[PDB]
Amino acid sequence: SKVVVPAQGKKITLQNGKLNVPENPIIPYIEGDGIGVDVTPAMLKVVDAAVEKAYKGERKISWMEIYTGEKSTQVYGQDVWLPAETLDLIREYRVAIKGPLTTPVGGGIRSLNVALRQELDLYICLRPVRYYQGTPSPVKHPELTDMVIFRENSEDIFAGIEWKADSADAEKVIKFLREEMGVKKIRFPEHCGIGIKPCSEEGTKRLVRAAIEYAIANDRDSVTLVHKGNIMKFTEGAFKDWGYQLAREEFGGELIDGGPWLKVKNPNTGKEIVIKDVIADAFLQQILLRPAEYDVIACMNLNGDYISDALAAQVGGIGIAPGANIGDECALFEATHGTAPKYAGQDKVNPGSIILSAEMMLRHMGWTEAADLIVKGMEGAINAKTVTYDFERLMDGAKLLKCSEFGDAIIENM
Amino acid sequence: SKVVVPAQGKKITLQNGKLNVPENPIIPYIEGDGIGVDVTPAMLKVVDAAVEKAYKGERKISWMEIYTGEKSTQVYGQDVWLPAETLDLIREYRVAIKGPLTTPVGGGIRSLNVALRQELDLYICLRPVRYYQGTPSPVKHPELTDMVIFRENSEDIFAGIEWKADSADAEKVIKFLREEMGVKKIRFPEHCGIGIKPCSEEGTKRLVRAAIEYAIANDRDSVTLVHKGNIMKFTEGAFKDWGYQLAREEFGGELIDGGPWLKVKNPNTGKEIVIKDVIADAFLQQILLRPAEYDVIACMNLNGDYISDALAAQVGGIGIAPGANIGDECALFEATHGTAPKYAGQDKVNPGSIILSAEMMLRHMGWTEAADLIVKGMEGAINAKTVTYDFERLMDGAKLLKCSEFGDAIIENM
Ligand SMILES: NC(=O)c1ccc[n+]([C@@H]2O[C@H](COP(=O)([O-])OP(=O)(O)OC[C@H]3O[C@@H](n4cnc5c(N)ncnc54)[C@H](OP(=O)(O)O)[C@@H]3O)[C@H](O)[C@H]2O)c1
Ligand SMILES: NC(=O)c1ccc[n+]([C@@H]2O[C@H](COP(=O)([O-])OP(=O)(O)OC[C@H]3O[C@@H](n4cnc5c(N)ncnc54)[C@H](OP(=O)(O)O)[C@@H]3O)[C@H](O)[C@H]2O)c1
Ligand SMILES: [Mg+2]
Ligand SMILES: [Mg+2]
């Protein structure tokens, strides 16, 4: 079983919290299915470029291609979707990036995107949403949005703990719930599917710990812990409580008058981070209406997904939203959208998303220089309204660049 | 125990599917907590008015006040929140309307709004969202939105089947799941809260049956069954399947090419209703972006809540959104927002919501005449931009009417 590791580079090492990043590291990349094949090459080009421009030849990346999804079955024999070589390599190599993956209906396989995340314990799904100036938006003021969404990745209904309607198993479960648990509340027990939803002190606390720290480090204004927690009192309602607990405990939360909101004092800055909560259904409105009062946000798995895609449409770029799956031993950055099964190979989709994800990646390695070079190029291209189809078609005379040509525009604006 | 039933009217009867509505019916109303006290009187005024104007004195309503929430404890002794007199009366009287209710933290009581709905088996939460012309909206084209949200009310995580983190009970459940069910997937079993999520053939099918029928009767264009069903395969993924099944089965769905979408032929009209699906997280974007392609929509409990409040902010009026809880033996219309615990008694909040809900109510009784009178008055007031605070404060010189005065403006525009 083999992936040709490049003879040109050196592994990144995690020397106790410190990510030791060499000058020529091996960073693995999973290509993708559909436009993964378009998108990815645009990414490598702009990344390699940002690296040349910034460090004037000193540093560079030995990209190692790994396999997952469609390609895995082709390379490893169709029956293999997520081989382990891939799981080790991400762990071992420390930082990895990926294009879009598809999960095959038919053979009882759960979401490949979620399989990677759960398996590698990448419990922090980091999703930042902000308005690049000149991006055609459906809302009046897309510029008021600049949020950093911290979504729990290892729990919630998203785990995959469910028994099919009428299976002997679901059947056994209902017998348990009613017979033993006293659940006189499942409305129609016959042919009823059951899903399970967990929330631990551990899972929520480790997530919030991460979120507040991001706030302190980047001097953010607040941390909003969202939860549909007045109905789900012991899962979501406990998300809120443990989060507040943590802010008080580990960070020194002072009460803002009669509660429940806290105050965390930013050591490095003197400013005080407001720790507050907002119920999920009411939050979905608050973000269209008073979006300038939210900054960093902590969520469970389900709401995090919903809030990311909701916030990403208002600021236009559903096609340019970046994402990171972060855990303790490694990290996996990714493209947050499909490949569009009709567009593959046509060199037509917006390659923004994967590009910003590499931007996030490059920043995480400590190459802050190549990072803002990429983001500046991005704004350059967009502002010059010489953009890709998805944007071009809502713009008053934008030049229509293809995927690759767009990557180029980014290099031209660095 | 007593509610003074009015000597002035006659009960509505449900004579087998046909709602026999007298000329002077007794329609019960639950006032509300906080602005329930503002809002409600505005409603009764405009309703009584619509009824005078339309039927020229012939018909009228003997309003019977019932009790739930804060008021219940006052009238019935504080310890009683949802007395049964109230539960019978709604059933017996057939149609009831309500203001906002609050649920007390502290005494282990679940949501009063959800208690009523579950208890009376009002399994259809009907939530229509459309743009009244002149309502200050945060999106560029709030006018493209005209959806009728059919949300499942008796199932989903919303049932209240959960065991607190660390309780002996949750503890027993985890032992079951891992020991007996082979669930090597609850990430941190220690101090983990567990919620339960069911979905029956029965619950989803009865909901979709209702939704499509609404489409046929009102000549709607399509029925979008939404579901986060590629991760929740046996609850949400089964919502989708059973729904399609129903459309094929009971309504005669023909396939649109290679699937999965169907075609239901509107008997009364010749037009063909498209039955399609959209995954939940992708739907939350599609509604900001291509909102004109969605019409009627079927949902489970959780997504229905999220989609209602999401759609209601884009079309501005989060404060004017109406709602209906419909079941087989009775129906309960309601105000879909809070009372704002700082605004109560100040005669300041927008009374739209409760007013439209009575509009919906009046329509359901068969008084289609009083119904569009109210909605025409509504548009009149708003268009004349002589509106309430919440609207007035985003309008270029609107006259600032108080709650009551606004009710009046509605009567002035009929
Ligand atoms: N993180 C991920 O890798 C990820 C996440 C979710 C789903 N997927 C997958 O991708 C698949 C493809 O099918 P779908 O079409 O149903 O996917 P989808 O991702 O929901 O599609 C979103 C659509 O919006 C537009 N948009 C978003 N990405 C764009 C881009 N790169 N360039 C231009 N405009 C963009 C395109 O509109 P048009 O289609 O109209 O051009 C695009 O196809 C499956 O849905 C799913 O397995 C992958
Ligand atoms: N269907 C229901 O009866 C229902 C549903 C949900 C919650 N509630 C309850 O109501 C409570 C009150 O607290 P909350 O303030 O947190 O409630 P909330 O309903 O989330 O508050 C929404 C806020 O948006 C604005 N808005 C919505 N209703 C309005 C109206 N009638 N007039 C003018 N603008 C309007 C007001 O802004 P400002 O507050 O800034 O003025 C309003 O208070 C509890 O949240 C909850 O138990 C009742
Ligand atoms: Mg998602
Ligand atoms: Mg709601």
Swiss-Prot record, chains A, B:
Coiled coil start-end:
none
User: Outcome of S111 to A/T?
Assistant: Decreased enzyme activity. Loss of phosphorylation
Q: What is its EC number?
A: 1.1.1.42
In terms of Gene3D superfamilies, this protein maps to: Isopropylmalate Dehydrogenase (3.40.718.10)
Mutation: S111 to D/E; reported impact is: Reduced affinity for isocitrate
Q: How is the cofactor bound?
A: Binds 1 Mg(2+) or Mn(2+) ion per subunit. Both Mn(2+) and Mg(2+) can be used, but Mn(2+) is 10-fold more effective than Mg(2+) in vitro at the same concentration.
Q: Which GO terms describe its cellular component?
A: cytoplasm; cytosol
Q: Which residues carry this modification: N6-acetyllysine?
A: K140
Substitution effect: K240R? Impairs enzymatic activity
Q: Where does Mn(2+) bind?
A: D305, D309
- What's the short name of a Pfam family annotated to this entry? Iso_dh
Activity regulation as described: Inhibition of this enzyme by phosphorylation regulates the branch point between the Krebs cycle and the glyoxylate bypass, which is an alternate route that accumulates carbon for biosynthesis when acetate is the sole carbon source for growth.
An example of a GO molecular function for this protein is: guanosine tetraphosphate binding
In the record, biological process GO terms are: electron transport chain; glyoxylate cycle; response to oxidative stress; tricarboxylic acid cycle
Q: Taxonomically, which superkingdom?
A: Bacteria
Q: Where does Mg(2+) bind?
A: D305
In chain numbering, the residues marked as site (Critical for catalysis) are F158, K228
Residues annotated as carrying N6-succinyllysine in the record are K98, K240
In terms of pH, how does activity behave? Optimum pH is 7-9. Exhibits maximum stability at pH 6.
What's the cofactor? Mg(2+); Mn(2+)
Concerning PTM, the database record says: Phosphorylation state of this enzyme is controlled by isocitrate dehydrogenase kinase/phosphatase (AceK).
Q: How does it assemble?
A: Homodimer.
What does the UniProt function comment say about this protein?
Catalyzes the oxidative decarboxylation of isocitrate to 2-oxoglutarate and carbon dioxide with the concomitant reduction of NADP(+).
Report the sequence similarity comment from the record: Belongs to the isocitrate and isopropylmalate dehydrogenases family.
Name of protein: Isocitrate dehydrogenase [NADP]
Native species of this protein?
Escherichia coli (strain K12)
What does UniProt list as this organism's lineage?
A: Bacteria, Pseudomonadati, Pseudomonadota, Gammaproteobacteria, Enterobacterales
